[PDB]
Amino acid sequence: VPFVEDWDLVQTLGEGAYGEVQLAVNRVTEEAVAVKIVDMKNIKKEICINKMLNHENVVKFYGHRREGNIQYLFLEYCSGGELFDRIEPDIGMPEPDAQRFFHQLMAGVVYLHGIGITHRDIKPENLLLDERDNLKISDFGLATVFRYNNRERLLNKMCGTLPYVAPELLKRREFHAEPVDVWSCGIVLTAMLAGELPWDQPSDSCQEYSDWKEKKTYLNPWKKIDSAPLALLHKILVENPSARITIPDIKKDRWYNKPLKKGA
Numbered sequence: 001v002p003f004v005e006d007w008d009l010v011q012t013l014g015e016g017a018y019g020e021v022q023l024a025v026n027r028v029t030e031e032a033v034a035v036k037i038v039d040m041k042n043i044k045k046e047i048c049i050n051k052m053l054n055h056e057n058v059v060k061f062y063g064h065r066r067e068g069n070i071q072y073l074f075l076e077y078c079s080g081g082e083l084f085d086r087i088e089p090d091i092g093m094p095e096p097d098a099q100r101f102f103h104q105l106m107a108g109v110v111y112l113h114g115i116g117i118t119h120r121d122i123k124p125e126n127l128l129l130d131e132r133d134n135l136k137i138s139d140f141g142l143a144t145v146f147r148y149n150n151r152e153r154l155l156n157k158m159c160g161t162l163p164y165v166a167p168e169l170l171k172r173r174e175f176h177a178e179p180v181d182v183w184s185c186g187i188v189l190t191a192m193l194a195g196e197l198p199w200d201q202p203s204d205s206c207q208e209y210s211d212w213k214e215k216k217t218y219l220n221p222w223k224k225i226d227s228a229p230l231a232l233l234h235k236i237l238v239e240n241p242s243a244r245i246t247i248p249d250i251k252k253d254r255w256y257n258k259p260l261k262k263g264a
């Protein structure tokens with residue numbers, strides 16, 4: 001069928017460092033995809049990782065075409081946009097909605113970690129929603145292999161987003177990858193349930209961070225969060241990444257398993 005590889009770029013979905021992500025609609029089928037435009041004048045690795053990914057809570061990769069200097073990455077389109085725009089400032093969102101998004105977040109992260117991949121920059125800006133509000137992890141531009149041939153590699157590159165970074169990345173030369181993603185997922189949860197981020201960064205100089213370690217949960221964001229999800233956050237946002245809760249244990253947490261939401 002003629003024309004079936006022609007795509008009209010119809011709308012900018014986002015504009016980072018690389019360039020842009022455009023909504024693309026097929027000339028013939030009208031299938032909608034997201035196309036990432038990355039002017040190579042680092043993405044080879046983003047593509048490399050994207051080729052490994054196949055899961056319902058991970059933005060699917062379809063393929064890429066290079067034309068001269070620009071690379072075109074063809075990616076699953078998520079019509080619900082970014083989790084960020086479901087978080088009402090200072091309020092957050094209804095707890096059953098946060099729990100469902102957190103469930104889906106975990107399934108995605110479990111998957112990635114299973115294939116030896118760390119995202120390194122989980123935040124509501126990078127967590128996308130499809131037409132049925134299913135969450136999908138996006139943007140693998142900072143992602144990296146932390147396990148290959150069943151051997152773990154400790155990380156050392158400082159990367160991610162300060163309010164979402166785990167404290168070890170600021171304090172230690174090297175660190176395990178998985179606890180960093182678990183930590184960012186907890187800050188995402190906090191934001192979902194409080195509509196505010198708890199600190200500019202998790203350093204002992206950061207007053208809001210010291211207060212959290214001092215267990216001042218009569219202060220915001222923590223006062224807004226119910227005891228049950230707050231109890232989970234006390235297990236996730238633990239300074240020592242060796243003592244921090246693992247994802248298999250997050251799946252056993254009382255809040256995680258609390259019935260709250262009716263089906264679609």
Ligand SMILES: CC(=O)Nc1cccc(-c2cnc3[nH]c4cnc(C#N)cc4c3c2)c1
Nearest residue numbers: 013021034075076077078079081082138139
């Ligand atoms: C109406 C509408 O579609 N709004 C809206 C808003 C924000 C992000 C998006 C968005 C929708 N679908 C996507 N699919 C992607 C795959 N990879 C990247 C990267 N890196 C970003 C997106 C993306 C972004 C869509």
